């Protein structure tokens, strides 16, 4: 996770 929350969003997973 790149938000330090515990969940990866679409454009997020792209970075995770």
1-16 burial, b if ≥16 CB within 10 A, otherwise e?
Answer: eeeeeeeeeeeeeeee
In the structure encoding, which two tokens stand for residue 2, read together?
């790149």
**Number of residues lying near La ion (CB under 5 A):** 4
Give 9's contacts (C-beta < 8 A, 6+ positions apart).
3
Q: Nearest to La ion by Cβ — which residue?
A: 3
CB of 12 to La ion, least distance (A): 5
Nearer to La ion, 5 or 10 (CB): 5
- Residues 1-16 within binding reach of La ion (CB under 5 A): 1, 3, 5, 12
Contacts to La ion by CB under 5 A: 1, 3, 5, 12
């Amino acid at each position: 996770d790149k938000d330090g929350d515990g969940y990866i969003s679409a454009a997020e997973a792209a970075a995770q």
